Amino acid sequence: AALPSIQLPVDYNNLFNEITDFLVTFKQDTLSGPKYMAMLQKVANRELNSVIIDLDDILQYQNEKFLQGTQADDLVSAIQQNANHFTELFCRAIDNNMPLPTKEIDYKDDVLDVILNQRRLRNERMLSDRELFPPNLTRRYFLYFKPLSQNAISSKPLSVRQIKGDFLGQLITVRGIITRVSDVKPAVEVIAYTCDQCGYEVFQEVNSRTFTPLSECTSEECSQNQTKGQLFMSTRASKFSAFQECKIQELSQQVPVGHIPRSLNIHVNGTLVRSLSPGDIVDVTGIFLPAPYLLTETYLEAQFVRQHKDVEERVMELITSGDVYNRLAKSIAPEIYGNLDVKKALLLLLVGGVDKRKIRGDINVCLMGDPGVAKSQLLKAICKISPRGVYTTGKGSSGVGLTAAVMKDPVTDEMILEGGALVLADNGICCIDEFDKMDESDRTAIHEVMEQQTISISKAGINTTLNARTSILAAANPLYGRYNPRLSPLDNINLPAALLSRFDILFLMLDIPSRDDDEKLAEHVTYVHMHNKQPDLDFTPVEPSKMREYIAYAKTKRPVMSEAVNDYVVQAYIRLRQDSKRFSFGQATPRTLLGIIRLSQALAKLRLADMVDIDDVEEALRLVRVSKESLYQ
Amino acid sequence: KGMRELNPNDIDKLINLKGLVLRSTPVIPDMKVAFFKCNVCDHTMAVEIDRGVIQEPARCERIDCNEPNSMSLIHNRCSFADKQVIKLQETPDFVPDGQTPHSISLCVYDELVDSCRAGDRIEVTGTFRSIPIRANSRQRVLKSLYKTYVDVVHVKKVDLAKIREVAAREDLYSLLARSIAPSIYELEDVKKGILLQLFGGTNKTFRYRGDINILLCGDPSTSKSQILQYVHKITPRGVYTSGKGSSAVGLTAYILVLESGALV
Amino acid sequence: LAPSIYGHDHIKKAILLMLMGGVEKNLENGSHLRGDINILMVGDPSTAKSQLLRFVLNTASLAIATTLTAAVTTDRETGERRLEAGAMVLADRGVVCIDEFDKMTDVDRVAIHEVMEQQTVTIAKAGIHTTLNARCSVIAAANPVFGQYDVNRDPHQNIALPDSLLSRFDLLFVVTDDINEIRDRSISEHVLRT
Ligand SMILES: [Zn+2]
Ligand SMILES: [Zn+2]
């Protein structure tokens, strides 16, 4: 099959010379050996494998040469135009110029050194008249081009649907959301075959999605002896590279009206693997390339990535200022009016009690009563403030759900077991909005959190319990739109009193129309709308990231029992039992006593003490007393 | 080291993975020796399989016969090892929780077959391995990215003298009763009844069974649920669930195949 | 707006306030409170509702016609799953027009709360756990699920939509086919000329 040919305005000999000149000369001299040769000494020490080339370095080198009065033939345009070939040129230049190691390596421990040394010895035995390898085999590093900064096409972040066929071969940059990521798998750069009948190994480089394996020994050792020896693949000696695929999709906002969102395959190789995860919003530089399916399949060979997204001294800045529990509680959602006792309890759920051996240490609160009053925003704010938090609703989060299951990926054919929200909330806190509406499986799921700190599986031959140690924050908004504000909650709420008895505290709150409290609430709301800042004075609202310092710091200040608290909490239980000597389900029980103990331990954590304080017990009892008096309405 | 962290350097090394068994194949026969019988002279010879390749004899071994292409494979006189493949999942405990757990296939051999079952959390120690896979079984053509698996060499999950010494004690009824749940209030009639439930009776095949069945009534505001939790931990092969909204088929067995419910 | 429509001055005024809707409030720590306005026209069929939605749709800009939220989706040829935008995501800082809103299914209505409270929608499967901007001002319309509309019963009672959903809208109109002879004479002669 004969081919025609044409002359073109390029020369890879001249550009190879330019590339090695750049490599052996350039440094970032505006910041005042060469950057690239020093980096290649790091490669030679086996301390580095990711060789990054900046197009800005190439541009600075071109400008330096042009300033010195010689044309650099705009290597930036060439690499932005036919990027894939210049990977080969850059790697050949490196292989022709990389300096020897400085740090010791124990060089014989690499199989490639032993096998190529043996081939060299055999070739010297031949060479006494009695390439050595394909270079990709010996090439340990991975080479990537990094785009131009703003100052050019590689710099511009294209949406996926702007990637047209004319860009094929160019080092473009794309922008979107990763909708799927592959597990890592190895791919052969060079296959190494042993030869059974002579021991002289032979090599095949692979440069496509498929190949055909070798059979007969092509080496002169066999071929000259006309000895038709058989070849066997060795994974020990074959060079593999890490491979991974990711599907990028344009952002949902970029989709024109009525169009389907367009998507693309990104292939990533070498050390750059597992730089991406699903749900990431990211800019990725790569070579936009065809693949064998006249319509070609197409993908992006990734090259560079831009994701869109001490303390133990710094906590002292808030500790030294004092009254930090009261202030931090007042910092919980300062845009929400009042209810400071509720906020003070919700903080203790993040701080937590003691678990011991078992003794169960999580702390749980239920909000109950009329809808609105910024409650859903408070639960969302808790999910924002708290570390290891998650927000749900009794019917929401309706994908993987709050309740766990065995599952397929029905878009493909494999099966997997995966956890629901209660497992993500493990070692943390789960917020249940619309708590009144959750079903029997959901209710038994939160039962299993409270009764085993797990969620169970009994399906498709798999019996397993997944770990779910987590605090519950919950919102039981009533039936029929409004509570009847003189009745027991069970005349207003769907949920069984059995479930409610497991919570450490319950706050019934009613949306009472009352001119005076209406005006106090309305003054707060209107002031927040008017002033745009400081939702109240003297609250000292701490910002989320700064208070996470103290929440994490407080969480680890585990207490030890004091005999004073042991007596005092026994007395506190007996005092509340006198009130229990009866008109609602807020009775004193061992679980309320445990709630007081855990709330007290969380207060001991917050006051940074080892000895738990009778003050902690009395304040824990105060929150329980306010809770019961709230429940009594 | 984590399943997510394996990389091309490991590909011939020995590794050790913690994980959850999702499921296993049946036992798969793997030919270790082929058996070749001569169509002409009925002479027989044995060939060890080398790297999955049958080293077929091209001519009959006996020099007094030596006919070419006369040997044929007598399948059920070949000798076979046992192989089994198991799907081992990254545990949901160790994942970065926003995205799925991985899983890896492992090959397990000979008497190590059926050493574990679905739902077992295990360690497996083995060589990491990789193999190519064909683009079409009618062709030698291979896909560039290899399949990977671990080829296991060891597995692990997750006396009477002492018993006789305790058996002579006089407080033994209360001693065993306290031990079931010393963290809960002592309620020792409940704990003694549960202790008898843990002992059980005897059986007779001629129907009756040596079971014991208990119902904890009383208020919802008491510790009985925690007692149940400890007893579920104590028993070798129990289950825990609850009865509100519990279906007659969900509790028992459900629908193609029928799968066992909690009670079964 | 809608000069062919008899009466309904207050409805048209409320529509204009939604088209000129309120200003966003990002408080300290970037704490977000929603400025956009949401409206729902309950009532009989054959009333001005759907025609008002036509006039709004052709008057507004960045306006999406529906008759929602966001989803993870798949189709015949795709061996892959893609994240899709509903009308509120498409109407981010725009408007949505929702006729026959009483017909919307449960998985939609459960997630409408995120639009109404947080002006956003959250994704929770296939590992795409993320949240999208859906910061629109909505106008919706709905019909009785059985019979003519009973003006004694609540919208929660004439239509299957929960009160805990209906209450999200800033303004909640109930319109009805008044049997006024002057109106009937006018619209009749218009239909006859048509
Ligand atoms: Zn050979
Ligand atoms: Zn023979």
mmCIF file with all atom_site columns, N, CA and C in Angstrom, chain A residues 478-505:
data_model
loop_
_atom_site.group_PDB
_atom_site.id
_atom_site.type_symbol
_atom_site.label_atom_id
_atom_site.label_alt_id
_atom_site.label_comp_id
_atom_site.label_asym_id
_atom_site.label_entity_id
_atom_site.label_seq_id
_atom_site.pdbx_PDB_ins_code
_atom_site.Cartn_x
_atom_site.Cartn_y
_atom_site.Cartn_z
_atom_site.occupancy
_atom_site.B_iso_or_equiv
_atom_site.pdbx_formal_charge
_atom_site.auth_seq_id
_atom_site.auth_comp_id
_atom_site.auth_asym_id
_atom_site.auth_atom_id
_atom_site.pdbx_PDB_model_num
ATOM 1  N N  . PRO A 1 478 ? -45.197 18.165 63.817 1.00 0.00 ? 478 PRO A N  1
ATOM 2  C CA . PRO A 1 478 ? -46.395 17.367 64.090 1.00 0.00 ? 478 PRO A CA 1
ATOM 3  C C  . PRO A 1 478 ? -47.228 17.072 62.850 1.00 0.00 ? 478 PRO A C  1
ATOM 4  N N  . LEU A 1 479 ? -48.246 16.248 63.079 1.00 0.00 ? 479 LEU A N  1
ATOM 5  C CA . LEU A 1 479 ? -49.309 16.006 62.123 1.00 0.00 ? 479 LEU A CA 1
ATOM 6  C C  . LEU A 1 479 ? -50.199 17.247 61.986 1.00 0.00 ? 479 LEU A C  1
ATOM 7  N N  . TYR A 1 480 ? -51.091 17.191 60.984 1.00 0.00 ? 480 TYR A N  1
ATOM 8  C CA . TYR A 1 480 ? -52.190 18.154 60.721 1.00 0.00 ? 480 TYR A CA 1
ATOM 9  C C  . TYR A 1 480 ? -51.756 19.631 60.759 1.00 0.00 ? 480 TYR A C  1
ATOM 10 N N  . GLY A 1 481 ? -50.484 19.923 60.494 1.00 0.00 ? 481 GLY A N  1
ATOM 11 C CA . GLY A 1 481 ? -50.061 21.300 60.306 1.00 0.00 ? 481 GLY A CA 1
ATOM 12 C C  . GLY A 1 481 ? -49.745 22.096 61.561 1.00 0.00 ? 481 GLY A C  1
ATOM 13 N N  . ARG A 1 482 ? -50.451 21.846 62.666 1.00 0.00 ? 482 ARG A N  1
ATOM 14 C CA . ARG A 1 482 ? -50.179 22.550 63.914 1.00 0.00 ? 482 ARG A CA 1
ATOM 15 C C  . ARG A 1 482 ? -50.454 21.641 65.104 1.00 0.00 ? 482 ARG A C  1
ATOM 16 N N  . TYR A 1 483 ? -49.640 21.826 66.138 1.00 0.00 ? 483 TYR A N  1
ATOM 17 C CA . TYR A 1 483 ? -49.819 21.191 67.435 1.00 0.00 ? 483 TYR A CA 1
ATOM 18 C C  . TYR A 1 483 ? -50.982 21.842 68.187 1.00 0.00 ? 483 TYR A C  1
ATOM 19 N N  . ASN A 1 484 ? -51.652 21.050 69.037 1.00 0.00 ? 484 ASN A N  1
ATOM 20 C CA . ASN A 1 484 ? -52.678 21.562 69.947 1.00 0.00 ? 484 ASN A CA 1
ATOM 21 C C  . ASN A 1 484 ? -51.983 21.910 71.267 1.00 0.00 ? 484 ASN A C  1
ATOM 22 N N  . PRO A 1 485 ? -51.701 23.205 71.569 1.00 0.00 ? 485 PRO A N  1
ATOM 23 C CA . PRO A 1 485 ? -50.611 23.510 72.518 1.00 0.00 ? 485 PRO A CA 1
ATOM 24 C C  . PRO A 1 485 ? -50.885 23.265 74.002 1.00 0.00 ? 485 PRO A C  1
ATOM 25 N N  . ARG A 1 486 ? -51.924 22.494 74.353 1.00 0.00 ? 486 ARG A N  1
ATOM 26 C CA . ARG A 1 486 ? -52.143 22.041 75.727 1.00 0.00 ? 486 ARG A CA 1
ATOM 27 C C  . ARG A 1 486 ? -52.115 20.524 75.895 1.00 0.00 ? 486 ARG A C  1
ATOM 28 N N  . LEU A 1 487 ? -51.915 19.753 74.826 1.00 0.00 ? 487 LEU A N  1
ATOM 29 C CA . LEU A 1 487 ? -52.030 18.299 74.862 1.00 0.00 ? 487 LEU A CA 1
ATOM 30 C C  . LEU A 1 487 ? -50.665 17.622 74.954 1.00 0.00 ? 487 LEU A C  1
ATOM 31 N N  . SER A 1 488 ? -50.705 16.318 75.232 1.00 0.00 ? 488 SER A N  1
ATOM 32 C CA . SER A 1 488 ? -49.517 15.489 75.153 1.00 0.00 ? 488 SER A CA 1
ATOM 33 C C  . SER A 1 488 ? -49.049 15.403 73.695 1.00 0.00 ? 488 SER A C  1
ATOM 34 N N  . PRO A 1 489 ? -47.734 15.279 73.442 1.00 0.00 ? 489 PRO A N  1
ATOM 35 C CA . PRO A 1 489 ? -47.286 15.202 72.037 1.00 0.00 ? 489 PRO A CA 1
ATOM 36 C C  . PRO A 1 489 ? -47.819 14.004 71.272 1.00 0.00 ? 489 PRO A C  1
ATOM 37 N N  . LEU A 1 490 ? -48.149 12.907 71.956 1.00 0.00 ? 490 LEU A N  1
ATOM 38 C CA . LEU A 1 490 ? -48.620 11.715 71.260 1.00 0.00 ? 490 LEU A CA 1
ATOM 39 C C  . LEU A 1 490 ? -49.997 11.912 70.635 1.00 0.00 ? 490 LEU A C  1
ATOM 40 N N  . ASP A 1 491 ? -50.736 12.948 71.039 1.00 0.00 ? 491 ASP A N  1
ATOM 41 C CA . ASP A 1 491 ? -51.937 13.374 70.331 1.00 0.00 ? 491 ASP A CA 1
ATOM 42 C C  . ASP A 1 491 ? -51.633 14.231 69.105 1.00 0.00 ? 491 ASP A C  1
ATOM 43 N N  . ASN A 1 492 ? -50.361 14.574 68.872 1.00 0.00 ? 492 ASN A N  1
ATOM 44 C CA . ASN A 1 492 ? -49.943 15.464 67.796 1.00 0.00 ? 492 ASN A CA 1
ATOM 45 C C  . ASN A 1 492 ? -48.891 14.860 66.876 1.00 0.00 ? 492 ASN A C  1
ATOM 46 N N  . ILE A 1 493 ? -48.139 13.852 67.328 1.00 0.00 ? 493 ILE A N  1
ATOM 47 C CA . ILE A 1 493 ? -46.976 13.312 66.630 1.00 0.00 ? 493 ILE A CA 1
ATOM 48 C C  . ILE A 1 493 ? -47.267 11.870 66.216 1.00 0.00 ? 493 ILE A C  1
ATOM 49 N N  . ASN A 1 494 ? -46.674 11.461 65.088 1.00 0.00 ? 494 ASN A N  1
ATOM 50 C CA . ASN A 1 494 ? -46.831 10.104 64.563 1.00 0.00 ? 494 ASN A CA 1
ATOM 51 C C  . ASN A 1 494 ? -45.983 9.090  65.325 1.00 0.00 ? 494 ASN A C  1
ATOM 52 N N  . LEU A 1 495 ? -44.790 9.497  65.739 1.00 0.00 ? 495 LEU A N  1
ATOM 53 C CA . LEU A 1 495 ? -43.764 8.577  66.200 1.00 0.00 ? 495 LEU A CA 1
ATOM 54 C C  . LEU A 1 495 ? -44.162 7.885  67.508 1.00 0.00 ? 495 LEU A C  1
ATOM 55 N N  . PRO A 1 496 ? -43.695 6.654  67.741 1.00 0.00 ? 496 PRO A N  1
ATOM 56 C CA . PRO A 1 496 ? -43.987 5.993  69.015 1.00 0.00 ? 496 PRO A CA 1
ATOM 57 C C  . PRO A 1 496 ? -43.135 6.543  70.149 1.00 0.00 ? 496 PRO A C  1
ATOM 58 N N  . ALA A 1 497 ? -43.721 6.536  71.350 1.00 0.00 ? 497 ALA A N  1
ATOM 59 C CA . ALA A 1 497 ? -43.010 7.010  72.533 1.00 0.00 ? 497 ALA A CA 1
ATOM 60 C C  . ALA A 1 497 ? -41.792 6.154  72.865 1.00 0.00 ? 497 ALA A C  1
ATOM 61 N N  . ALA A 1 498 ? -41.760 4.899  72.405 1.00 0.00 ? 498 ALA A N  1
ATOM 62 C CA . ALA A 1 498 ? -40.587 4.049  72.594 1.00 0.00 ? 498 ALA A CA 1
ATOM 63 C C  . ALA A 1 498 ? -39.343 4.680  71.977 1.00 0.00 ? 498 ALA A C  1
ATOM 64 N N  . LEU A 1 499 ? -39.454 5.132  70.725 1.00 0.00 ? 499 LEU A N  1
ATOM 65 C CA . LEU A 1 499 ? -38.336 5.787  70.055 1.00 0.00 ? 499 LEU A CA 1
ATOM 66 C C  . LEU A 1 499 ? -37.935 7.067  70.777 1.00 0.00 ? 499 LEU A C  1
ATOM 67 N N  . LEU A 1 500 ? -38.923 7.866  71.181 1.00 0.00 ? 500 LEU A N  1
ATOM 68 C CA . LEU A 1 500 ? -38.642 9.144  71.827 1.00 0.00 ? 500 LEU A CA 1
ATOM 69 C C  . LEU A 1 500 ? -37.945 8.955  73.168 1.00 0.00 ? 500 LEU A C  1
ATOM 70 N N  . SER A 1 501 ? -38.186 7.825  73.839 1.00 0.00 ? 501 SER A N  1
ATOM 71 C CA . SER A 1 501 ? -37.571 7.573  75.136 1.00 0.00 ? 501 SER A CA 1
ATOM 72 C C  . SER A 1 501 ? -36.063 7.364  75.047 1.00 0.00 ? 501 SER A C  1
ATOM 73 N N  . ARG A 1 502 ? -35.529 7.028  73.868 1.00 0.00 ? 502 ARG A N  1
ATOM 74 C CA . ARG A 1 502 ? -34.096 6.795  73.733 1.00 0.00 ? 502 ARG A CA 1
ATOM 75 C C  . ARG A 1 502 ? -33.293 8.086  73.622 1.00 0.00 ? 502 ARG A C  1
ATOM 76 N N  . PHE A 1 503 ? -33.909 9.175  73.163 1.00 0.00 ? 503 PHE A N  1
ATOM 77 C CA . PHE A 1 503 ? -33.212 10.453 73.085 1.00 0.00 ? 503 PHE A CA 1
ATOM 78 C C  . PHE A 1 503 ? -32.824 10.938 74.476 1.00 0.00 ? 503 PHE A C  1
ATOM 79 N N  . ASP A 1 504 ? -31.642 11.553 74.571 1.00 0.00 ? 504 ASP A N  1
ATOM 80 C CA . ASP A 1 504 ? -31.201 12.098 75.851 1.00 0.00 ? 504 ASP A CA 1
ATOM 81 C C  . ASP A 1 504 ? -32.087 13.255 76.301 1.00 0.00 ? 504 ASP A C  1
ATOM 82 N N  . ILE A 1 505 ? -32.606 14.047 75.359 1.00 0.00 ? 505 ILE A N  1
ATOM 83 C CA . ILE A 1 505 ? -33.426 15.217 75.662 1.00 0.00 ? 505 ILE A CA 1
ATOM 84 C C  . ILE A 1 505 ? -34.422 15.402 74.522 1.00 0.00 ? 505 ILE A C  1
#
